[PDB]
Structure formats: structure tokens, C-alpha cells
Design a protein around this ligand. Structure first.
Ligand SMILES: Nc1ncnc2c1ncn2[C@@H]1O[C@H](COP(=O)(O)OP(=O)(O)O)[C@@H](O)[C@H]1O
Lengths: 151, 152
């Protein structure tokens, strides 16, 4: 599994003129690429790290407070394109990303888990597999990348 | 190097209440991270991929046109945090990132190569090593991740 985590002052998600469906203020936004080979353990790691990484400075100390401590929110977006690859070819290909049926199952398990470990009010989501437009207010900015096949 | 590309309809870059310094309409934001032991080969590759990746749909076809095909802009932001090491502990470690002085000079050699291979006015930068506020209208969203270390 893969995650691009971006720290933000706020993010406004929309769908088709567009109408707003999701919204967060301070917190994180996590672009979530699910790999064909993702066991539920791959998911677990992504979640803990998303919730317990210390990305906010604290009236004193840098890289200290996580999303939970500061009572901030999370926006988890499905990103098939995180495995959009490298080999010669400027077109991407997402045949390394989990098959988009078993993936939707997985993704929604993940969001239960996010809620079950945080607080269900604090996990705002996307329309899985739809076109979205997201205004993001990157703060820093700060961009964490994480890949669970590295372990 | 590692790069995080997002396809965008627009992007406004602020520094220090805040000040705007950089703005693109349709194009890409590249969050660029520079490894301690990066080479000029690595940098070339990244430039080739931002510039050449076909991410915009066109007529009947998906993933058809690249940033250049469409005369779209690019905003290039240094991002040492891409080398945050989160394997041990929940306080990230930025040790494998190039150090600011050395990384600044590289970054600039990376920018100028963008302006070389493309055109000046399509390349926007932030302020290196300063807090920035960046409103990114995310188009899709489409988020690409290349890391050149997985190559030769
Ligand atoms: N490559 C880098 N580029 C820019 N800033 C860095 C880099 N590495 C570390 N820092 C800064 O230093 C802090 C964490 O690393 P540092 O203090 O340099 O080493 P250590 O974590 O061993 O004390 C952070 O506040 C970060 O802003």
C-alpha cells in the first residue's frame, strides 16, 4: 500500500459547475494507493502511521504532535495513480493497483478502521472511483510518503 | 530523487499575514525531494517525467497530452520531507535528505534545466527553505509518485 500524506489548513472536496461533498479544516489528507498484494496488515500500518505521525510543531518543539492529539481531521482519497509507474512510457498504468472491485471492499474496511481507531466524525472521505476536485491548503507544505512493501 | 506530482487546475503560493509569490493555472505541482547521494542523472529523469508524463485526457483518449503539449505551467517546490524516515518511531527522520545549502544549489540546477528543456514562463518556484502556504486546486485528483532510486 502507498500513502502520500499532506498536512493542510483545510481541504474542500467536490464532484460534478461542481457541488461540495466533503470538507476538512486543519489536519491531513492522505492519498491512498492500494496495491494488488495488499494484505490487511498493509492497511493496518498505513492507518497507525496516518493517525500517529507527529507532523505539527508544538509551542516549543518541532515534529511533535499528531492528528489525534490536536483533534484534527483526515481526508482519505483513493489514488489508483500512486503506482502509476516508471518504465519507459509517459502514459501511466494501474495494473499494479488492486483490482478495483476487491479494492473498494478493502478501502471501506480501512475507513471503518480509521474511525474505530480515531473517532468517526474525524474521518471525512471521497466518492470512491469518481472524478473529484479538491482544493487543498498545503501547510508548510509537508509531504510524507509511505510504502508498506519496504517492510 | 523522489517526486510527488499532482495534476492541478491551479495553485497559489504564499510566504510570510501571508504573501502570494507564485501562481499557476492548469498544470502540475511537483513536490521534489533530494536524496543525500543524488546525481544529475536522477534530476534529469524527474524533469523528463514531469515534462513528459501524459496525464490530461484529450478527445476520445485518456492519458494523452503532457504538460508541454497543452502549454500548461509547472510549479516546482522543494520538499525535504519526502525523505522523512518513518520505519523507526513516529517522529520522522530526515537524515537521507541532502543538506539545505547543497540541496538549494542542486534544486536551482534542476529548475534551470526545466526552463532549458521547456520555457521560462511555464516554470514557477516557491521560496527555498521557507514556510509556504499553497492552495492547490486538485484536478481529479491525479497524484503521481516516482522515486529514481528504483532505477539505474
Ligand atoms: N535535509 C534537510 N533540509 C531541511 N531541513 C532539515 C533537513 N534535515 C533536517 N532538517 C531540519 O532539522 C530538524 C530535524 O533534523 P535535524 O535536527 O537536522 O537532525 P536530528 O533530527 O538528528 O536532530 C527539523 O526541524 C528540520 O526542519
Amino acid at each position: 500500500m502507498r500513502v502520500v500524506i499532506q498536512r493542510v489548513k483545510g481541504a474542500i472536496l467536490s464532484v460534478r459547475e461542481l457541488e461540495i461533498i466533503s470538507e476538512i479544516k486543519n489536519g491531513l489528507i492522505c492519498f491512498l494507493g492500494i496495491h494488488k498484494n495488499d494484505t490487511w496488515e498493509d492497511a493496518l500500518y498505513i492507518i497507525r502511521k496516518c493517525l500517529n505521525l507527529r507532523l505539527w510543531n508544538n509551542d516549543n518543539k518541532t515534529w511533535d504532535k499528531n492528528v489525534k492529539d490536536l483533534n484534527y481531521e483526515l481526508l482519505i482519497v483513493s489514488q489508483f495513480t500512486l503506482f502509476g509507474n516508471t518504465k519507459k512510457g509517459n502514459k501511466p498504468d494501474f495494473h499494479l493497483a488492486k483490482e478495483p472491485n476487491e479494492a473498494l471492499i478493502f478501502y471501506n474496511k480501512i475507513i471503518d478502521e480509521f474511525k474505530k481507531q480515531y473517532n468517526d466524525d474525524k474521518i471525512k472521505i471521497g466518492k470512491f472511483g469518481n472524478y473529484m476536485n479538491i482544493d487543498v491548503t498545503n501547510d508548510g507544505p509537508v509531504t510524507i510518503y509511505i510504502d508498506t512493501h519496504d517492510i
